[PDB]
C-alpha cells in the first residue's frame, strides 16, 4: 500500500509511518519558485528512492547527488522497523537555483514509524497468528482462510469470555503517539446487532472486561502503549446467519489524525478483519450417541423400564423428563432439536427450542440454547441425512429434510422463518419432502436413517403400507386370518380387530394404496436428492387410517420413528397380530434388520394408555457427537 | 431419474412415462398370497430388466423365463421413444404358485410415453437448444451456463414482446394425454414480482399473447397437443437485482395427476429452468461515444456553439436539451446516468432517472428507463473506472466509484437504496471514495478518466490545488503577479482578482492545503482499489474556497469534469490569469495532455452568467457503446 505524503517548504512535515506501507513523496510542490534542482539527506533507518518517470534509484544517507526538479520525479520512502525513543527518523530535501550550489531552502519530513496490526486466527488453528495476509477475506474449503466466530448461545469476567474468539491489536512504537493521533476500533451500524466485543479498558484498576462494540456502540478509542504491546479483545457472534444476513461481519481499526476543531479526523491507516459466524448444524442418526433424552408421563412404567434397558446395552446416558404445562406430550422430539456449532478448537452442542405455549426446560450447562403455527413447524418434521454424494456433489454434513406440501396444493408448510433459517446455515443444503398427507404432518412418521453396523454405509428406512398388506395377506393365507391386533390393550378389545377385519375393509385398502403413492413420491425425491438406490432402502410395514381432510394417522404405532443408537434400535412396539405367540410385525421387522447386524428392541409406549388412536404420548431425542469433518472445509454452492 | 410405479394384481395400472426417466416397478406386492414365481411379457418399445439384489438382466418381449418372487427382485422399465396412436406399450406380469405352470393371476402395466421439456437458451447463443442438461442451474464465467433475462425497461402483440426471452415447452406424444393428467406452468409467490410470462392461450382465435404468470398469477394450465409440438412463451424480468434479490428466478412445468376430488394433484414429473436477470452496467469514459447530451439555458450561446464545434470533430451526434421546472440546471449530468443491459444477441442502453422534483424528459425510443436526499445522491457523484486488474483480480467492466464521507465522520452518504442497487449488480464491484469535503459532494468535481490515444491504456485525472499554487507562484516569480483572473466576466471585475491577490490570501492557502489532503486521501484509495501507479495519474490545477461547514467549492471552473470523446476533450474554460494573452491554466493543461495525443477544446459555460460563484449551470453526458466483454463471462466474488 502506497500512501501520499507531500512536503511543504521552508518548513517541516511530521508524519506517522505505518509499517507495511510506503510513502510516495512530492518534492516538487515544496520547491520554491525558480528552484532548478534538489538534493536530499536521510537518517539511517529511513530508506529513500528517487523515482523519475517510473525509474527508482536508492539514495544514500548523505550523498551530494542532485536531480532536476520535475513533477514526474518523486521520492519513495520506506521504513522496515518501528521507531523507538532512540530514533530520529527523517528525510531532508534541499533546493537549489541555477546561480550556485548552496541550498536556497529546505523542506523536512520527520517520521515516527509504528506497527499496527489487528490480528485474528484466520488460518483456523486456534492461535492468533501475526498479520495473516488473508485476514480481511473469508474463503471456504480445505485451503480456505478467515476467522470464525461462535454465536453466544447462553462489567464482565474473563472466565465468562472463554467461549468467545480472540482478536489482538498488536503494536510497536515509541513511548507515545505523536501529537494529534489516536487509534479507534469500530464496526458498521449494520453489524452492530451481529457482534459484540469486550476489552479491559482500565487494566491498572483491575481485570474488568467491558462491552465496547455492539448495539449503540460503533467505535471505541483504544489507548496506545509504547514498545511492543498487545491489546486483547474477545469477540462474540450475536445471531446465526439468516435470510438477510450472510454470516459475515467485519471489525476495523484506524489510526486517525486530528485536523482541527469541527473537521472530521482523517483515517491515516485502516486494518480490517472479517469473521464468519459458525452455522447451526444438525446431527444425523449415524453419529455416535452421547445422551438419550425421553419424555413421558411418570406412570408409563413399561416405556421407562424398556428405554432404560435399551440404553443399558450402550455406553450412552439416559436423561428422563416428565410432562410440562407449556409443552406437548412429545416435546423432547417436537419442541427441541439437537445440533452443534464449532470453531477451531472450540465447539458445543446447541439446542433449538420452540416451546408450544412459550417458555416458562433445559438439560445441562453443556448446551447452548436458541429459543424462538401448524403441526409442520414441529421438529418431528425435520430430519437430516447422513453424508452423501449426489452426481459428484458432496454433502459432507448430510442434507436437512423438511416436510412440506406440493407447490400448487394450497397445503401446509413449515413457517418461512424456520425454512429460511435452515437454508441460511448453508452447510446442510435442505430438501423439502412431502409430509402434508399426514394428519400431524411430520417426516419422522414415515422415514428414518440407520447406520449399517461394521461399515461406513447407511440405510433409508421407509414406512410401507404395501409391505403390511403383503404380510397380512400371507398370514391370512396361512390360516391366521383370525389373529387379533392390540392384544393386551383393554380399550381396544371390543373392536375385535383381526387380520380378516382389516383385509376386508375396502375403503381402508383404497386409503392405504393412496398413502403408498404418497410414500413413493417421497421415496423418489429421497433417491434423487440423496443419491440413493433401491439397495439403500428397507421398507417397514405400516398402516394408516384416513381423516376428513384425506390425511393419514397411524393405525398401529409407526415403527420407523425409532431410537437409533449405533447397532441398537429402540423400535415402537406395534401390537400386531399374534402368530404362534409372537407379533408378526415384530418378527417381520427382525427378519429385515437383524441379518444386517442391527439389534432390535421393541419399546412399548402405549400400554399405559390401554389403547391406540394414532397418537403417541412419549418422545425421545438423542444428543450425538459432532461430525469429524470441519464445516469450514466444505465448499457450498454460491447463492 | 428413477420413478416408483407399483403393480396391482388381478388388475391393471395405467401410467404416463416421461422420456428421460425410468420406472422401477415392484412386482412382489401385486403377487397373490402364496405365489412363488413370476414371468413377464412386454411390448416392442418397452425395455424391461429384472433387477435382483442390484443385478440387472434384460428380458425379452416374450420369453418363458421365471424368477423367484422376492421383495429384492424388481423390474426396471425404460422407454426410448414417445407413444403414438400406433403404440400399445405394456408390460404384463404373470404369477405362479408351486403346484403348476399355468399363471394363477396377472398384473398389467399400460404405458403412454411422452416427451416433456421446458427449454431455454442456457448455452447463451440466442437460440433455444433442446433440453440443455444444465438449464436448471446458473453459473458464471467463460464456460458458464443458464439463461439470461432482460428487465422490461419500457392482451399483447408479438411485436411488443421482441425484447423478451424465449422459453419453449417441447412435447411429443399421442393425440391426447391419458385420462386424469394435465400440464401446468408455474412460479413461486416470491418470484411473482420478479418475472412475467406471456403465451397465446387461444391460437385458433388469433395471435393474442396474454400475461399468464406474474403478480397474482402463480400457475397456468397449458393445453397439450399431440404429435411433436412446441408452445412458445415470452419471459420478461420485472426488476433488477437489489439488496434482497439475487437476480435469479425459476420457472417450472409439471405433469399433474388427478387423484380424486378434494385431494391435491400429484406432480408426476417436473422440469425447471432458471434465469438470471441481467444487471445494469455503467459505461466508463474509455468506451466509444455515440451521442452527446447537453443541457443549458437557451441563451448560453457560447457553450452551445463550442460544444457543437467539439462534437463536429467527431462522429458523435449532439442532442441539446434546455432547462425544466422539475430539474436542476445540471440535470443531464445529475439526474440521468447512462448504462446498458445485455442478453445473448440482445441489448440496449438503459438510463437511470432520479428527477429532482419528480417526473412531470426522455430522449428516444432506443433507451430503457429506470425511474426512482442530499447532494451526494446525484449521479455527478457516480463514476465508473475503465477495466482494471488489481493484485491478480480482474474487473473486466471496471469498478463503480461512489463519493462518501469517512465511516466515523457523521457526514453525508449516498442513500442506501442506491448504494445497495449498485452493489447488487455485482459486476462493477463498487468502491466508496471521499467526496464529502466538497460543498456539493460529487466525485466528478475532483476526478475523471481519459483513454491514452493509440493505446489500450488510460489515465486518472485528479484535481490538484498544489499544482495550481505551484503554477501561480512560478508566474508571480516571472513578473506576472498582476495577471488578472476572470477577464471578460463583468460581474467579477470589481474584485480585481490577480495572482498576487490569491497568493497573499493566507487563509485560502491553508484551506487549499487541507483540500489537497482530501484529494490525496482519494488518490491513495484509487491507486489501491484500481491498481494504479503514479505513472497512471495526471494532476490538473484546481482551486477551492471553503464554506462554513469547512467544505470546498470551486474558485474557478473545475477542469477535471470534462467531456471525453476518445482523443477529443471538452474542458471547462477556467478563466485563469492571462500571460502573453493566453490563459496560463489552459496552456498548462495543454502542456500536460497534448503530448499524449489528447486534443483539448476549452468550453465556456460561464460567460453567459457574467461571473462565477462556484456553480456551473450546464451539464453534459455521453451515451457510449457497451463493452465488448460479455458480463456473464465474469466470475464475480461470492457474497
Ligand atoms: Ca491461527
Ligand atoms: Ca427432528
Ligand atoms: Ca442456445
Ligand atoms: Ca455520473
Swiss-Prot record, chains A, B:
Top-level taxon of the source organism: Eukaryota
Primary site of residence: cytoplasm
Record's keyword annotation contains Plastid: no
Catalysis: reaction(s): L-arginyl-[protein] + H2O = L-citrullyl-[protein] + NH4(+)
Cofactor(s) in the UniProt record: Ca(2+)
Enzyme Commission code: 3.5.3.15
Residues annotated for Ca(2+) 3 binding in this entry: 154, 163, 366
Task of the protein: Catalyzes the deimination of arginine residues of proteins.
Subunit structure: Homodimer.
Protein name as catalogued: Protein-arginine deiminase type-2
Organism: Homo sapiens
Taxonomic placement: Eukaryota, Metazoa, Chordata, Craniata, Vertebrata
Amino acid at each position: 500500500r502506497e500512501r501520499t505524503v507531500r512536503l511543504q517548504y521552508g518548513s517541516r512535515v511530521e508524519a506517522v509511518y505505518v509499517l507495511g506501507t510506503y510513502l510516495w513523496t512530492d518534492v516538487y510542490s515544496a520547491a520554491p519558485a525558480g528552484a532548478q534542482t534538489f538534493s536530499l539527506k536521510h537518517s539511517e533507518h529511513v530508506w529513500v528512492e528517487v523515482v523519475r518517470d517510473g525509474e527508482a534509484e536508492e539514495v544514500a544517507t548523505n550523498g551530494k547527488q542532485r536531480w532536476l526538479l520535475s513533477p514526474s520525479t518523486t521520492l519513495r520512502v520506506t521504513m522496515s522497523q518501528a521507531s523507538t525513543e532512540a530514533s530520529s527518523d527523517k528525510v531532508t530535501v534541499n533546493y537549489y537555483d541555477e546561480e550556485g550550489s548552496i541550498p536556497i531552502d529546505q523542506a523536512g519530513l520527520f517520521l515516527t514509524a509504528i506497527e499496527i496490526s489487528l490480528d485474528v486466527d484466520a488460518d483456523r488453528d486456534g492461535v492468533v497468528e501475526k498479520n495473516n495476509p488473508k485476514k480481511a477475506s473469508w474463503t471456504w474449503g480445505p485451503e480456505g482462510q478467515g476467522a470464525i466466530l461462535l454465536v453466544n448461545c447462553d462489567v464482565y469476567s474473563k472466565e465468562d469470555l472463554k467461549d468467545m474468539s480472540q482478536m489482538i491489536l498488536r503494536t510497536k512504537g515509541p513511548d507515545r503517539l505523536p501529537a494529534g493521533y489516536e487509534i479507534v476500533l469500530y464496526i458498521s451500524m449494520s453489524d452492530s446487532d451481529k457482534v459484540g466485543v469486550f476489552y479491559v479498558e482500565n487494566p491498572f484498576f483491575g481485570q474488568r472486561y467491558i462491552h465496547i462494540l455492539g448495539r449503540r456502540k460503533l467505535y471505541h478509542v483504544v489507548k496506545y502503549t509504547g514498545g511492543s504491546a498487545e491489546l486483547l479483545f474477545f469477540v462474540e457472534g450475536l445471531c446465526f446467519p439468516d435470510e438477510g444476513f450472510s454470516g459475515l461481519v467485519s471489525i476495523h481499526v484506524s489510526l486517525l489524525e486530528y485536523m482541527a476543531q469541527d473537521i472530521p479526523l482523517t483515517p491515516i491507516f485502516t486494518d480490517t478483519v472479517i469473521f464468519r459466524i459458525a452455522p447451526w448444524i444438525m446431527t444425523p442418526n449415524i453419529l455416535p450417541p452421547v445422551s438419550v433424552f425421553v419424555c413421558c408421563m411418570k406412570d408409563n412404567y413399561l416405556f421407562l423400564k424398556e428405554v432404560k434397558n435399551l440404553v443399558e446395552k450402550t455406553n450412552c446416558e439416559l436423561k428422563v423428563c416428565f410432562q410440562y404445562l407449556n409443552r406437548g406430550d412429545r416435546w423432547i422430539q417436537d419442541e427441541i432439536e439437537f445440533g452443534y456449532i464449532e470453531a477451531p478448537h472450540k465447539g458445543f452442542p446447541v439446542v433449538l427450542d420452540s416451546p408450544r405455549d412459550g417458555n416458562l426446560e433445559l438439560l445441562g450447562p453443556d448446551f447452548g440454547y436458541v429459543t424462538r403455527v401448524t403441526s409442520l413447524d414441529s421438529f418431528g418434521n425435520l430430519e437430516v441425512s447422513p453424508p452423501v454424494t449426489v452426481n459428484g456433489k458432496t454433502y459432507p454434513l448430510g442434507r436437512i429434510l423438511i416436510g412440506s406440501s406440493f407447490p400448487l396444493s394450497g397445503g401446509r408448510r413449515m413457517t418461512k422463518v424456520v425454512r429460511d433459517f435452515l437454508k441460511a446455515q448453508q452447510v446442510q443444503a435442505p430438501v423439502e419432502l412431502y409430509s402434508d398427507w399426514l394428519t400431524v404432518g411430520h417426516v419422522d412418521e414415515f422415514m428414518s436413517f440407520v447406520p449399517i453396523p461394521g461399515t461406513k454405509k447407511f440405510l433409508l428406512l421407509m414406512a410401507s403400507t404395501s409391505a403390511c398388506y403383503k404380510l397380512f395377506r400371507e398370514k391370512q393365507k396361512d390360516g391366521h386370518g383370525e389373529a387379533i391386533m392390540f392384544k393386551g390393550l383393554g380399550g381396544m378389545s371390543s373392536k375385535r380387530i383381526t387380520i380378516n377385519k382389516i383385509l376386508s375393509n375396502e375403503s381402508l385398502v383404497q386409503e392405504n394404496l393412496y398413502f403408498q403413492r404418497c410414500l413413493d413420491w417421497n421415496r423418489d425425491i429421497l433417491k434423487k436428492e440423496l443419491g440413493l438406490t433401491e439397495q439403500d432402502i428397507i421398507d417397514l410395514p405400516a398402516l394408516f387410517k384416513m381423516d376428513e381432510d384425506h390425511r393419514a394417522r397411524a393405525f398401529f404405532p409407526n415403527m420407523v420413528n425409532m431410537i437409533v443408537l449405533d447397532k441398537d434400535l429402540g423400535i415402537p412396539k406395534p401390537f400386531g397380530p399374534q402368530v404362534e405367540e409372537e407379533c408378526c410385525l415384530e418378527m417381520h421387522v427382525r427378519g429385515l434388520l437383524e441379518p444386517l447386524g442391527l439389534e432390535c428392541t421393541f419399546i412399548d409406549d402405549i400400554s399405559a394408555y390401554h389403547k391406540f388412536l394414532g397418537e403417541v404420548h412419549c418422545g425421545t431425542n438423542v444428543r450425538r457427537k459432532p461430525f469429524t469433518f470441519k464445516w469450514w472445509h466444505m465448499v457450498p454452492s454460491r447463492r
